[model samples]
Target: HMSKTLQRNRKMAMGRKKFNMDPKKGIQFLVENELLQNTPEEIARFLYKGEGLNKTAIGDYLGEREELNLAVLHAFVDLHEFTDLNLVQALRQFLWSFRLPGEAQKIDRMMEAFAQRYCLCNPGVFQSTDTCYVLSFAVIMLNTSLHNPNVRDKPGLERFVAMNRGINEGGDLPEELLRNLYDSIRNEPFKIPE
Candidate 1:
C-alpha cells in the first residue's frame, strides 16, 4: 500500500537513528520511576546505553561510573525532595500549558543552539544524531533553573534575558520569527488552545 518513492523513503528512515542520545524510552522510564530512586550510576548507565555510545569508548572514558556526574542529578532531586521548587514547578507549567512568547523565546533560542551543536558534532556517534533527547534535556535544565529562586530572580533571569538579547541582536533569531512574536500574546491560549 505504498508507492516506490514512499517505500524507499521508509526504508531509508528505518536505518537511520541518531546517536549522542536517543531519549524515547529513557524519559518514559524516568517518568515511571518518578521518585528519582535510581542510583546515579544506574542513571549514567541508562544515558550511555540510550545514547548508543561505543562500548570501547564508554569503557575507556569511564571504567567505573563517575559519582560526580550522578551527583548532579541527585543534587537536583535533593533540592526538590522537600518541596516543589520553582524550577520543577516551571517545568510542570510548561507541560501543562504554552509558555508566554517572552518565556518561549528563551527556550527556543536554547533549543536552536543545542540542536545545531548536536547535529553538527554528535559526541557519541559519528553519523547518528538525536534532537528530542537534547530538547528534553533543555526543558529539564529550565526546570532546574526555576528550582533556584535566587538564580531565577538574579542570575538565571539575567542570563536568559541576555541570551535572548544576544540571539536577537546577532540575527541568530530569524526576522520573521521576531516579527511574529512581536505581537502581544497577552491573551493567547495555552498549549491546548481550544
Candidate 2:
C-alpha cells in the first residue's frame, strides 16, 4: 500500500507528464503563457462561435480558428491588461502556430496598429472630458482609412470607427460631425472643427 505522500507524489508526476505531452491544450496552456483570467471553456466557446462550419469540420482547435485566434490575442490585450510587449509576444506565438500564407505580415501590421491605438487611448484623469480618448481613437482610424486610397467605402469606414468606439452596429453618429471627423482623421494639423 502506498503512503499518502507517495500517492500525492505519484499524482503530481502524472499531472506533469500530461502537461508535458500536451502543454497547449486548455486553461493550463493559457495560464502558462499569459496572465489571463478566463476559463478554458470561455476561450473554447469564443473560438467555436467564430469558426466557419467548413473550418470547424476540418479542425475546431483554437489555433486553427484564425479570426478567433486574433480575437483571443485581442482579448488578452483588452481584458487581461497585457502590456504592449506581451501583446506582441502573444501575437507572435499565435502567428507562428497558425501558418496562414501571407497573413503574418497582415497580422503584424494589425498588432502594430493595435499597440499604437492602445497607447493613444491611454486613460488619463481628463479622459472623460471633451477630448475623450475614444473620440480620438475613432478619429485616428478614420483619418488613416480616408487617406488610404484603397479604402473607398465611406459607410464601411464609418462602421469600423463606430464599432471600435464601442458603438452598437445599429447606432449612428451625427452625420455632419461624422463627416467632419472623417476628414479630420486624414487632414494635417487636424481638428474636428467643433
Candidate 3:
C-alpha cells in the first residue's frame, strides 16, 4: 500500500505538461534547432516567458501588440549584443547553476554544439566561453520581470500606500500589510506543490 501510494504521488508530480528542450540535447539544442526557426523576436518570447504547446500559442498570446513585439525584439537584440557568450551558451550557463552533478559535461557539449551552429548562422568571436552569465541573467530577468504587470503595479501601489500612510500617521506602512501586498504580487513557482 505504501509503494502504491508513492507511485501515485510520483505520477501526480510528473503531470502532463511538456518541456520544449530535450533532456539529452539540452536547452541550447532547443534554442538552435527549434526556437531559431522563428523570428528572433518570437524566440525572445520563448526565452522570456517560455511557451505552451508550440509557436502558434506564442503567436496567439503575443498577437498584434506591436509595442510589445518591438520591446521583445529590442530586448533580444540588446541581449545578444551585450552578452559576451553566444545566446544559447549564455542561457545554458545561466541555467547550469541549477543543475545537478554529472550534468555539467553534457551541458558543456550542448553549449558547444549551440555555439557551432550559432557561428554557422552568423559571424562572431568565439571566447573561451566564460563570465557575463550574471549580466545575461539580469537581461533575461528584465525581459520577463519588467514586463510583468504585477511586478510593476505592486511596487507602485506600495509606494502610494506608504506615501498616504506617512501623511496620515507620519510612519511607514505596517509590516504585515506590506508583506501581504508583496505576497499577492510575487512570482509563483513553476510547478504546483503536491
Candidate 4:
C-alpha cells in the first residue's frame, strides 16, 4: 500500500529529476573534461556562464521545445556579466532547493529572481527583438519547468509568465520576438547614427 506521503513524494521526485540538473553526472563531466579547472567558483560560473551543456537533456526528454529552447536558456545564463557570487549562489539554492512542500515555490522564486536580477542590473540589455526571442526560451522552460507528473513547482511557472510578459512592462523588443533572437546574430539592425 502506498501511503499518501509516498505517493506525493513519488510525484515530486519525478518533477525534481525533470528540472534538476544531474549534479553527480554533471559535476563529474565537468571535472573529467577539465571544465571546472579545480575551482569551486568555476562550477557555479560554468553553470551560469556556460551554454548548451544541458541542451541535450532538455531536447531529449522535454520534447516540446528543442534547439530554440536551449538557445534561449544559454543566452539568459550567459548575460550574467554583472553577477555577484553571493546572489548567484542564493539564486541557485532557491531554484534547486528541495525542502519538500516548498520546492515548487522556491523554483518559481528563483526564476523570478533571475529575470528580476537581469532587469534591475541590466534592464536595457535585452530591449530588442533578438533579446526577447532568446529570453522566451527561458520563459518557456520555466513555464513547463514543473510540469512533471509529481513535482509541480508553481513558482517556477509564474516566473516564466512574468518573463514572457516583460514586453507589456515597457520592454520595447523588436517587432518579431523569435526572429530577433535567432536570426539577429547574423543580420545587423539598421544603425541610426546618433
Number of the top TM-score candidate: 4
Provide the lDDT at 42 for model 3. 51
* Runs off by more than 4 Å, candidate 2: 1-68, 79-106, 109-113, 116-194
Q: After superposition, how far is residue 1 of candidate 2 from its true place, in Å?
A: 21
Screening candidate 3 with a backbone cut-off below 3 angstroms (N, C-alpha, C), the clashing residue pairs are none
- Point out the higher-scoring one by TM-score: 2 or 4: 4
Model 3 agreement with the true structure over 25-71: per-residue lDDT tens digits:
22234444443333556546444444332333322322323554444
Q: Would you list the rank order by TM-score, best first?
A: 4, 2, 3, 1
Task: In angstroms, give how far residue 131 of model 2 lies from its true place.
Answer: 17
lDDT per residue as tens, model 2, 3-105: 9767655544443344334524433544454422355445534333332222222122333336655555444334323243222232233333323233555
TM-score of each: 0.20, 0.24, 0.21, 0.27
Model 1 weakest lDDT span, ten residues long? 181-190
Question: How good is model 2 by TM-score?
Answer: 0.24
What clash pairs does model 1 have?
18-129, 19-128, 19-129, 87-146, 87-147
Order the numbered candidates by lDDT, best leading: 2, 4, 3, 1
Q: Write one digit per residue (lDDT tens) for candidate 1, span 1-194.
A: 46976765543333222211333233334434342235555544443332333332222222223554334233322222213222223233333322212245444543343343333432432122233333234335444454445664422433433443433223343433222322212113223211
Cα TM-score of candidate 4? 0.27
Better of 2 and 3 by TM-score: 2
Worst 10 residues of 4 by lDDT: 185-194
- Between prediction 3 and prediction 4, the one with superior lDDT is 4
Overall local distance difference test of candidate 2: 0.41
